[PDB]
Design a protein around this ligand. Structure first.
Ligand code: HEM
Ligand SMILES: CC[C@H]1[C@@H]2C=C[C@@H]3[C@H]4C/C=C\C(=O)NCCC[C@@H]5NC(=O)/C(=C(O)/C=C/[C@@H]4C[C@@H]3[C@H]2C[C@H]1C)C5=O
Length: 390
């Protein structure tokens, strides 16, 4: 069988997809676990993520298709189908609606400003990744939850083990052991004095309301502290890099600040954030997909990066047109597991571009472009460093 993931470097979209779009659904072999079909068409990836005939749970003895040694199993939102998924997620729901998240815009700019003060203080050329991409989204969610600043490094280390393809079940055991004790302390302390942060709301939901159990309370906090900043950090650098590599660099968004939200959406469609793939889904009944009968139990991988370049949904899909304003990308997913932080991420990315254009309109790469240190063979695509000058 065709091997997957496919060869690519940086944010390169590999040409093999232009072949597969014209072809029927094709089966592939993965680094670990069972084989799977590759959903790449826009409508198919949508069906995998939102049709109730595709379950995220391997309830038929499947060995999960994956790029990581130890399979991704736990008690959080990615381990559940509706309605069970829907009940647990509703514990967090109200805190991530657009109405709640628009309120954080001011603070997001505050932290973004503080990061750039430090970056500018360090002198040109400086590493945008270390000075902004990493600290800002980390600070945002950690202070949403109630995690103090000097412990941020701990949650970065835990998050990277989850996302590293060389993680064994043993490392995941270690992470789990270390994360449970740390959150174990915050629980005791919030039981000994309430606080108006988000982990404190989880403690009320477990202890006062009986809505959730202790391990569910822990799981939800793990989900948000694992999925909640590393992806944004990668995108801040990926987006800036895409923009700085063009002749006009940031000038168009300097000239037309009102077009920043669209640029954020276009970049979300264009950037192949993933080197691997997310969770496979499993057909719960026989069904037809791009000329193939997918049988009950068989796995299908939703390749978000290919959906976002469907040749019939997006004309000239390889072109980054910040005015494209195309049909809705699947970059935050779709259906039940559609990113709970989608708006927070849009807010974070919009503000970063506001602050960078208003402050460094002549931003530019600080090293030659071909010297850039793209991460090789990682789960997410991105940069080890992003030197910038101004
Ligand atoms: C650019 C930044 C981000 C991107 C590209 C992104 C993308 C995604 C995607 C595509 C999914 C669905 C994956 C699948 O269904 O297989 C997802 C799920 C999730 N994301 Fe995000 N996300 C981003 C930022 C965030 C932020 C800021 C948060 C903060 C809460 C977050 C928390 C989550 C959680 C908890 C889930 C699982 C939800 C569920 O299973 O119900 N992500 N993300
Ligand atoms: C740019 C967007 C990214 C996105 C960003 C973060 C998510 C990752 C982290 C989310 C949750 C999390 O760790 N919770 C702790 C429970 C343990 C449980 N046990 C596992 O082993 C496990 C995983 O490995 C999960 C991997 C998630 C892949 C997700 C990524 C897919 C892309 C679309 C579990 O869910």
């Amino acid at each position: 069988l065709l091997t997957f993931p496919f060869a690519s470097t940086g944010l390169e979209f590999p040409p093999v997809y232009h072949e597969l779009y014209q072809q029927r659904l094709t089966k592939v072999r993965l680094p670990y676990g069972d084989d799977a079909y590759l959903a790449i068409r826009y409508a198919d990836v949508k069906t995998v993520l939102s049709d109730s005939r595709f379950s995220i749970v391997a309830s038929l003895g499947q060995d999960q298709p994956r790029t990581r040694a130890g399979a991704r199993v736990g008690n959080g939102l990615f381990s559940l189908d509706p309605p069970q998924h829907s009940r647990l997620r509703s514990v967090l729901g109200r805190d991530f609606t657009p109405r709640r998240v628009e309120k954080l815009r001011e603070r997001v700019r505050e932290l973004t400003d503080q990061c750039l003060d430090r970056m500018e203080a360090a002198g040109s050329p400086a590493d945008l990744v270390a000075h902004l991409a990493v600290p800002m989204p980390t600070a945002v969610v950690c202070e949403m939850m109630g995690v103090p600043e000097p412990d941020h490094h701990l949650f970065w280390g835990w998050a990277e083990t989850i996302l590293s393809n060389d993680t064994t079940p043993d490392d995941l055991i270690r992470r789990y052991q270390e994360f449970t004790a740390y959150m174990g302390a915050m629980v005791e302390e919030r039981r000994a004095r309430p606080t108006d942060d988000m982990f404190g709301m989880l403690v009320r939901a477990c202890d006062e309301e009986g809505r959730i159990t202790e391990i569910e309370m822990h799981a939800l906090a793990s989900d948000l502290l694992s999925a909640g900043f590393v992806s944004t950090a990668h995108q801040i650098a990926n987006f800036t890099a895409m923009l700085l590599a063009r002749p006009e660099r940031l000038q168009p968004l300097v000239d037309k600040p009102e077009q920043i939200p669209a640029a954020v959406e276009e970049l979300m469609r264009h950037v192949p954030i993933l080197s691997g793939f997310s969770f496979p889904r499993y057909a719960t009944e026989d069904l037809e997909m791009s000329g193939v009968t997918v049988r009950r139990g068989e796995a299908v991988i939703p390749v978000i990066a290919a959906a976002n370049r469907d040749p019939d949904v997006y004309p000239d899909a390889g072109r980054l047109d910040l005015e494209r304003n195309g049909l809705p990308h699947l970059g935050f997913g779709q259906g039940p597991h559609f990113c709970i932080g989608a708006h927070l991420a849009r807010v974070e990315l919009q503000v970063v571009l506001e602050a960078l254009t208003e402050r460094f309109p002549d931003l530019r790469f600080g090293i030659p472009e071909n010297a850039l240190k793209w991460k090789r063979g990682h789960f997410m695509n991105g940069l080890h460093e992003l030197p910038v000058a101004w």
